[PDB]
Design a protein around this ligand. Structure first.
Ligand SMILES: O=C(O)[C@H](Oc1cccc(C(F)(F)F)c1)c1ccc(Cl)cc1
Lengths: 257, 252
């Protein structure tokens, strides 16, 4: 009944708060004035870049990309911590635990990145910086294009006006897919996702009573995530040929495929 | 209220029955609700092919699939016309919705013709095995992704009355690129989504979160379609060079 599903919802939200520093709520408070204390240094061209390094401490195109990838790997750690708290997750076959994270983290990374973005740019270094979209778009060689798809998603995704309590459940749903390739035991995964889907449905009805079919519309966005991730990986294998200079982390090229 | 959404559901189902000759129900009766009036002819290797009565083989098989797709597109177009509100949209947008919708719909309906072992062909008269397809240079792999989708998709045990609404949902996607007026499209999809939700609760009271699970499958359709196109342009360099058919590849 309703009551159990709210409990699951609260539990998740708490794990989310504990696993992710930098909530959407915090992000939105930074992006929308809201503060003297919280206001970000803005990077929009080469020079502001250099100041940033002096103030909001951490080829340019290479450094920026590598930094993105470094932050991704510590996001994966946060996501992994979160997953552990999803009821039932740790009781799964460990092979499957790994498979769910393997295929889930990117989709989740892009979901959360949307909270850090608006149409004009994206927060960086724990929200202290903000790097414009145009400045990203202008980078050398094939780097001038890695972030754009993610901005397009973000703008659409953020139109749903979800809050952290909505996102915590949606993220759990993503992890517990069961369509992931190479899963040994799909049934227990679906059973868990089933509950998550109910928790989410109820959560959205309560938290967005005015919003017709938000549940549906949110699930439809998973199509968009998947396309982003496949674009990213294919982009990646180019910035690996050409940039044989480039290296990837022990959490990453394992995930990639 | 419920009542209006059932009306929309019935209306759609009726249009579906009129627009598509071979229903899933019929297909299922042929594939296995057997003891039938007529079993399909089975193609499992080169020879059964030839009798199939009813120019590299791999080429002909692919081209045939494409010819059948094009007449499916006509059926789908007829169906769309009956979706309430569709014909009232900007015509540019009507075209855009069909342009980007038909493939997703084609793979959805193809699933009704498939099981893990193969696929019905020529109005259900034939059946071509998966292993025979799998064995065809790059042709031996075009159908495999679609079998994987089909098996998963068909696990949802949807019937024609479920599929009719789902298909409408697909068409009325306002994330298609180049749409002029997204709002009316979403408004229509919104209703369709309700009709579907109710439809699945009533037609599958046993199955928890079927709505959710069905929408999740759209992720799979979209990947399939992008794989297909990104396979297709490789066909462009095998053997369609010839020009004993300028009007055909024009049509197809
Ligand atoms: O010939 C057929 O009956 C069938 O055609 C198709 C092809 C695509 C789509 C559809 C349908 F409209 F039924 F979805 C039928 C078919 C299916 C697979 C292949 Cl490899 C060749 C031909």
């Amino acid at each position: 009944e309703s009551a159990d599903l709210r409990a699951l919802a609260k539990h998740l939200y708490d794990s989310y708060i504990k696993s992710f520093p930098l909530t959407k709520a915090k992000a939105r408070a930074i992006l929308t004035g809201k503060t003297t204390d919280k206001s970000p240094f803005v990077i929009y061209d080469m020079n502001s870049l250099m100041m940033g390094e002096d103030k909001i401490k951490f080829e340019v195109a290479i450094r920026i990309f590598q930094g993105c990838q470094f932050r991704s790997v510590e996001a994966v750690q946060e996501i992994t911590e979160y997953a552990k708290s999803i009821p039932g997750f740790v009781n799964l076959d460990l092979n499957d635990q790994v498979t769910l994270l393997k295929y889930g983290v990117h989709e989740i990374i892009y979901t959360m990145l949307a909270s850090l973005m608006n149409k004009d740019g994206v927060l960086i270094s724990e929200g202290q910086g903000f790097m414009t979209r145009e400045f990203l778009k202008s980078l050398r060689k094939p780097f001038g294009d890695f972030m754009e798809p993610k901005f397009e998603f973000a703008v659409k995704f953020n139109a749903l006006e979800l809050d952290d309590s909505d996102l915590a459940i949606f993220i759990a749903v993503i992890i517990l897919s069961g369509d992931r390739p190479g899963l040994l035991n799909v049934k227990p995964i679906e059973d868990i996702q089933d509950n998550l889907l109910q928790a989410l449905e109820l959560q959205l009805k309560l938290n967005h009573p005015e919003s017709s079919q938000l549940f549906a519309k949110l699930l439809q966005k998973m199509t968009d995530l998947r396309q982003i991730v496949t674009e990213h990986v294919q982009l990646l294998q180019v910035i690996k040929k050409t940039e044989t200079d480039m290296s990837l982390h022990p959490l990453l090229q394992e995930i990639y495929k």
